[PDB]
Design a protein around this ligand. Structure first.
Ligand code: ZN
Length: 49
């Protein structure tokens, strides 16, 4: 699909769970954390001692 979306968005980011539509990386960050906390993975801590 080309006609319509004024300028295709790069790095099509879509939730592998609900499969919603997002524009900013912020919305996904949170929405995902809750919706699908599976993917959401980042080193926060504490670490192994
Ligand atoms: Zn989702």
């Amino acid at each position: 699909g080309s006609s319509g979306s004024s300028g295709q968005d790069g790095g099509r980011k879509i939730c592998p769970r609900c499969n919603a539509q997002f524009r900013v990386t912020e919305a996904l960050r949170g929405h995902m954390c809750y919706c699908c906390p599976e993917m959401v993975e980042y080193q926060s801590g504490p670490s192994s001692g």
